[PDB]
Amino acid sequence: GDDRELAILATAENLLEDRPLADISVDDLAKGAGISRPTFYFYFPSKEAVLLTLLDRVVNQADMALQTLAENPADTDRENMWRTWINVFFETFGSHKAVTRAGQAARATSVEVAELWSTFMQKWIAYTAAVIDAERDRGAAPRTLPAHELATALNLMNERTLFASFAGEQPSVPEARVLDTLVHIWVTSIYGEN
Amino acid sequence: GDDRELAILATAENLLEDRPLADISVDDLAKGAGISRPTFYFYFPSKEAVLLTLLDRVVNQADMALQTLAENPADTDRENMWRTWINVFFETFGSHKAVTRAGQAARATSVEVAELWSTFMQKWIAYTAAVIDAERDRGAAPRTLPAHELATALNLMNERTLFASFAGEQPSVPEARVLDTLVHIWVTSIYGEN
Structure with missing residues (x-):
């Protein structure tokens, strides 16, 4: 069965x-x-439909693993928070690389995949935006960019920066030094005045 | 003929x-x-080969337009420099959208396209890195991330952030407010200490 x-x-x-x-x-x-x-x-x-279902496994793996984290606030400095948020991508997609890659490639074709990937991104960008607003209200980050807009760029950077490294692209940041990278970009832009 | x-x-x-x-x-x-x-x-x-040649027109359009800028240093504040660098992408690819999109989509297939796009990115990332090193030596930016690594992430953000907006993706930063976005991300991360 x-x-x-x-x-x-x-x-x-x-x-x-x-x-x-x-x-x-x-x-x-x-x-x-x-x-x-x-x-x-x-x-x-x-076959397209097989690939769909596997991508779904992966995205939800990463969706779930991501909500656990959200509900379990790690007890650490803001920088080490963001990192541990971002890492949940590196670990998930960075595990099922093969699927991860093919999924991306086939956004081109599958209006179903395009949807499936979009929905998840919107969810996390919206959430990420939600954070930043709050980070600005708790006073610890200044009000420069529209939050939702910032989030989108930051998240789209991730999607692309990460999946570049996985497929081991030319050019791309090596798996080792990535994270530290995005994380750095996340802090400096969220908490940065100028 | x-x-x-x-x-x-x-x-x-x-x-x-x-x-x-x-x-x-x-x-x-x-x-x-x-x-x-x-x-x-x-x-x-x-047909694949037609698409190739058009992409080549566009990339070189953007390559050339980009080197003119490099050789003509705009006389302005660092922030308004980066913006005017980045803008040369928004204007180029943001003109031939149709080609821009299809080109990206068909990195999946064309090992020729994959190459053609890579080469150009490496060129500009390397150049961008070159800047940052210098920006650090002129003293005006601090030494946090490896420059070449930072550049890659920043540039990959652009490629993806920009072409998301062009195709008008779900989710994506609207053409209007993009730039200001990337530009903000560029400054805060290049010049940002923490």
Whole structure:
């Protein structure tokens, strides 16, 4: 039942490590998960749809892991807060790299993926904005940019800066030194007057 | 001769406004530029290759426009310098939006496009890094992040922040208020101590 479903997915993920969706056939995922062609079609209606579901696993992994953090305020200095917020991306997407990458690539095509990714970003940008407003009201950060706008840029930086490093792009900040980077950019711009 | 070539391209660009490469045929670009199917193939060996050449026009437009600026130091305060540097992106890519978008989308596929875009970024990040080192040596910016690393993140933010706004994404900073945004992020992080 679900046994079968999950293998389709685990297999989806592992063939994705070394090659893009396109050059993975549909008998590719079947053969791997040890099921017949049409046994697959019962479970997922197209390969695109497999990739969708895995991305969904990942995003929610990162959604959930992110809300736990929100509800558990770490007890630390503002800089070490932001870092620990940002890190939850580095750890999640930085674990399922293969899916992470393909997901991004296929925003181009899937109006479903484009949506799925958008929704999550809006959620966290809005939340991030919410923080900054509060950081300004607690008095500890000054009122320079519209918060929601700042957040968007900062968050979009992350999405791109992070996924550049994962795919190991040319050019890109190495996994090691990233974070410290974004984190630095986050503090200096949130708390910075001029 | 070149008459014919250029029309293929102008047409390439205008059909791209309202729909993606994929759903533009090859008789699409011919019919538009008023030439026969194989007359086209003499000029460009595939549609992908048309898109390549237009992206090249744009990048170099922005490359050139960017080096003029470099060689003509604007006479203004550091903040109004960075802005006028960044603006040269907003104006270029923000003019050929259609090409700008498709180019990005098709980094996924074209190892030629991926290269073409990379090279340009490396160039400007390296240059941007070069500035910051100097800004630190003239004493006016403090030595916090490795410059080249900072530059990368800042530049990758731009690429993504900008092209999000162009395609008018959900979520994205509106064209109006962008710049002021990135610019703010640039100053606060370059000149910011903590």
